[PDB]
Amino acid sequence: GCLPDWSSYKGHCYKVFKVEKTWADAEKFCKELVNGGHLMSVNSREEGEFISKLALEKMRIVLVWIGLSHFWRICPLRWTDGARLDYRALSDEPICFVAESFHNKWIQWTCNRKKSFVCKYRV
Amino acid sequence: CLPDWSSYKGHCYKVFKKVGTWEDAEKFCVENSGHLASIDSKEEADFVTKLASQTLFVYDAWIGLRDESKTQQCSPQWTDGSSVVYENVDEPTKCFGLDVHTEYRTWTDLPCGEKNPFICKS
């Protein structure tokens, strides 16, 4: 019940885009494309394998942006001695993740780089 | 401070060359009545960077900071709003150390199981 050229799998719709964009641009692109659209979320090993096969075998894409990103500012960083985290010498840039088509593993990647991506929405 | 440690603003510091995982490192510091170094100000930071630079640039150096989230990575949710339950992160990096690439001037996330020299503070 997906729109044309979108692939279906267990009640969700997927579409791999070869055009390369930054993580932020890709997420926005998915959002404006369809209602409820977003960079793909991977909620099970089976879903992961499904998308990897589609991107690699059908489009020859090895790395795609997935909907995971965060800033250290929002992580529970704690000092082993209980001290409060006042001063910090950490990057204030976000961390983004891509999934690799061979083993479906997720790798940290600089967010401002350009990579292919996958949009997903629920039927 | 012991003869081989350095004294700074009420604390004693020492950089250990014997490499160990982050966890072992903390335990060794504990054994020496301390903990992996915590840094509370830019001035203390500059001191630790200096001590590390004059004792060690091929390895990063463990400090006492760790990402305590129970998940492999830090985000609790995807951009579509679903919770992060299933995860397949290649190599989680939840422990922090002084970055060799900035000459120990900044902090970087590393695999907690990696063996690096470390710095104790007591």
The secondary structure of residue B5, as a DSSP letter, is S
Is B67 within 8 Å of A45 when comparing Cβ atoms?
Answer: no
Q: Distance, in angstroms, between A65 CA and closest chain B CA?
A: 12
Nearest CA in chain B to A98: B89
Q: Which of A80, A93, A103 to mutate to test the interface with B (most CBs of B within 10 A)?
A: A80
For A122, half-sphere exposure in the C-beta direction (CA atoms, 13 angstrom radius) is: 6
**Separation between Cα atoms, residue B43 and residue B1, nearest integer Å:** 20
Q: Distance, in angstroms, between A58 CA and closest chain B CA?
A: 23
Is B86 within 8 Å of A86 when comparing Cβ atoms?
Answer: no
DSSP characters over A3-63: PTT-EEETTEEEEEEEEEE-HHHHHHHHHHHSTT-EE----SHHHHHHHHHIIIIIT---E
- Do A101 and A62 meet the contact criterion of CB atoms below 8 Å apart? yes
Identify the residue whose tokens are 């001695």. Answer: A81
Residues 6 or more apart whose CB falls under 8 angstroms from that of B65 comprise: A77, A78, A79, A80, A85, B38, B95, B96, B107
What values do phi and psi take at B12, rounded to 5?
-115, 130
The secondary structure of residue B26, as a DSSP letter, is H
Q: Enumerate the domain spans of chain A.
A: 1-123
Pick from A95, A3, A10: which is nearest to A49 by CA? Answer: A10
Three-state DSSP at A116 gives: strand
Pick from A86, A101, A113, A4: which is nearest to A48 by CA? Answer: A101
DSSP characters over B38-68: ---SHHHHHHHHHHHHHH---S-EEEEEEE-
Q: Distance, in angstroms, between A75 CA and closest chain B CA?
A: 6
**Separation between Cα atoms, residue B69 and residue B62, nearest integer Å:** 19
Please count the residues of chain B. Answer: 122
- Do A19 and A56 meet the contact criterion of CB atoms below 8 Å apart? no
Is B44 within 8 Å of A87 when comparing Cβ atoms?
Answer: yes
Is A70 within 8 Å of B45 when comparing Cβ atoms?
Answer: no
Looking at domain A1-123, which CATH architecture does it have? Roll (3.10)
Would you state the torsion angle of the CA atoms of residues B42, B43, B49, B53, taken in this order, to the nearest 10 degrees?
150
Solving technique: X-ray
Distances in Å between the Cα of A3 and the Cα atoms of A6, A12, A35, A102, B49 are 6, 11, 12, 28, 57
Is A77 within 8 Å of B68 when comparing Cβ atoms?
Answer: yes
The secondary structure of residue A2, as a DSSP letter, is P
Domains belonging to chain B, first-starting first, are 1-122 (3.10.100.10)
**Separation between Cα atoms, residue B103 and residue A109, nearest integer Å:** 22
- Do A65 and A98 meet the contact criterion of CB atoms below 8 Å apart? yes
User: Which amino acid is it at B20?
Assistant: G
Pick from A72, A107, A76: which is nearest to A91 by CA? Answer: A72
Tokens of A92: 């204030």
Identify the residue whose tokens are 């492999």. Answer: B72
A69 neighbourhood in chain B, CB within 8 Å: 75, 79
**Degrees (nearest 5) of the Cα angle B65, B75, A46?**
125
Is A80 within 8 Å of B73 when comparing Cβ atoms?
Answer: no
What residues pair up with B8 in beta bridges, in sequence order?
Answer: B11
Distances in Å between the Cα of B43 and the Cα atoms of A23, A27, A31, B40, B50 are 36, 40, 45, 8, 11
